[PDB]
């Protein structure tokens with residue numbers, strides 16, 4: 193199978209660092225410089241072996257053709273009203289980027305408002321954030337190039353879709369919030385830095401500030417409204433209250449669901465927005481999350497997890513703000529997580545719950561919190577919503593494993609509410625009735641019951657004969673809920689596969705306690721949970737180790753890379769996308785400092801002792817048993833991934849190829865592909881998505897010798 197040779201890769205045997213008495217050698221530390229001739233030559237040499245391996249077997253073309261056919265279906269966002277007009281996103285099927293449309297009424301002719309496709313030949317300029325002015329007449333939007341997190345903000349007048357001159361640079365991880373007087377907009381920027389700011393650099397991002405841009409002026413005149421010079425990791429995002437009276441500042445440090453909450457009563461400014469605002473430090477610690485829902489005068493409704501790990505709604509009166517005075521509007525549920533809340537039609541709340549990893553949607557009274565109406569849903573996810581306080585209708589978008597889903601609409605001015613199907617598309621080529629989704633709960637090592645969804649063809653025999661594709665993430669309070677993937681359904685239909693998604697700890701599926709169960713000292717629970725999911729699929733006869741592929745991206749790429757090191761005997765194939773691999777150095781680059789809330793940081797002796805045990809870069813070891821080799825492994829990254837800098841995957845593949853690839857018993861390939869004009873994944877054009885999934889499934893097919901089923 194292996195008709196190539198791994199590239200020679202220099203080992204700097206002098207690269208030795210002491211961590212609290214523990215010496216660590218890092219012979220590929222030089223791969224941390226993305227700009228060097230050495231690193232560029234490494235990337236070229238690696239792509240030179242991977243690409244022919246992926247493209248060789250005809251199965252890639254079969255998969256690509258079917259993906260192109262089946263992914264070509266119309267894709268809509270919810271409609272949403274801003275001022276006098278409605279907007280929605282739409283992709284006719286295979287456009288690289290979805291297009292923003294406008295119409296003057298629901299029954300009215302729609303026209304193109306913003307088409308990002310015309311901004312690049314290859315679809316690599318994408319929308320990243322936007323905000324309409326409160327009256328709907330002006331529009332700010334972020335553009336990112338080549339998949340970087342960096343944003344340039346541009347502006348348009350809505351009537352006539354007129355480009356304006358205003359341009360804001362150095363924007364990253366930014367809010368966008370217009371004052372209701374229509375004068376200007378809050379946003380965040382970083383100070384100037386040496387070197388590049390295009391997504392290929394690794395430079396740490398510190399000292400983010402909050403600015404106010406007056407429409408019709410140069411960025412150099414923007415007002416500095418908040419800064420944290422003694423706290424370089426703090427990030428302050430602004431939003432206006434629904435009545436326009438208050439700027440609410442949510443300060444974050446790290447990725448935990450907590451924030452400080454400061455407010456500025458704009459009417460109390462001495463002369464409008466002229467400098468640092470008169471912040472009132474309502475919640476001046478990082479002990480809980482406070483997510484603004486709405487206010488009525490001084491009574492502010494927040495979604496919180498303060499002593500409520502499944503979340504709840506509280507009212508804080510700014511005139512009586514002591515915690516013992518807060519009113520619990522909607523108490524916490526014993527098991528169900530309150531995922532998000534919106535206020536609509538003045539005095540309604542829309543609450544979206546997660547119940548055993550499936551969404552529900554409810555309408556409640558704002559004054560009392562009482563339940564008024566259940567909006568019924570099939571088993572799946574709510575993935576889009578519109579309906580703000582001044583609006584009188586909601587749209588929401590549902591999706592599931594087997595259907596691209598439905599957009600529903602409900603006119604909330606009606607005495608008797610009845611949600612109605614607004615848009616529904618069906619994918620022909622996949623008959624949903626041929627498949628089933630089951631949810632099971634399996635015990636992990638410590639006995640905890642973990643949910644898992646399994647999707648498969650109805651009537652299969654559980655005789656261990658089927659290829660399986662097992663996905664997980666496990667971190668950052670992210671809940672992995674049902675979603676429609678044509679790419680995975682092609683694996684089911686045309687490769688005879690079984691799909692599985694394990695809701696391992698670290699996620700948000702059972703609230704903040706589920707999250708804390710997969711972080712810091714307990715990060716190993718994630719790996720244990722995921723290995724136990726694989727053991728479940730094997731014991732129950734869905735699959736066998738030689739037929740099992742695991743996949744994860746980002747924090748999920750860490751997941752699958754560590755699982756390869758810890759249990760190589762369990763997996764046939766591992767695909768780690770954009771993964772965090774160097775757990776000792778991740779905090780040094782770009783925004784990696786923010787992840788210390790899930791992982792810890794190697795600067796601490798205690799944290800180092802957790803991290804060293806599972807860090808993928810530091811645990812590559814030949815399996816002791818003669819009959820055990822590493823699984824086939826493919827790492828996917830891209831040269832503008834400034835979220836997880838690609839040195840993680842570069843150093844990891846160098847280590848895999850040297851320690852394991854050189855061994856006589858290793859015949860499974862250990863490969864990387866580094867894409868160009870792409871980053872962590874947000875905004876990736878359709879063309880690149882199709883190539884990526886074709887690479888993934890070709891790798892699986894070749895390594896596991898799976899025949900195509902037409």
Ligand SMILES: O=C([C@@H]1C[C@H](n2cc(-c3ccc(F)cc3)nn2)CN1C(=O)CCCc1ccccc1)N1CCCC1
Pocket residue numbers: 365427444445446447668670746747772783786787835836
């Ligand atoms: O990018 C990240 C983390 C994960 C975190 N995240 C993503 C999602 C998500 C969920 C659903 C979905 F469809 C798409 C994305 N939810 N949380 C945002 N993150 C960051 O690093 C965010 C960086 C910016 C930041 C930092 C601190 C405070 C605020 C903002 N990581 C990369 C390596 C592992 C963590």
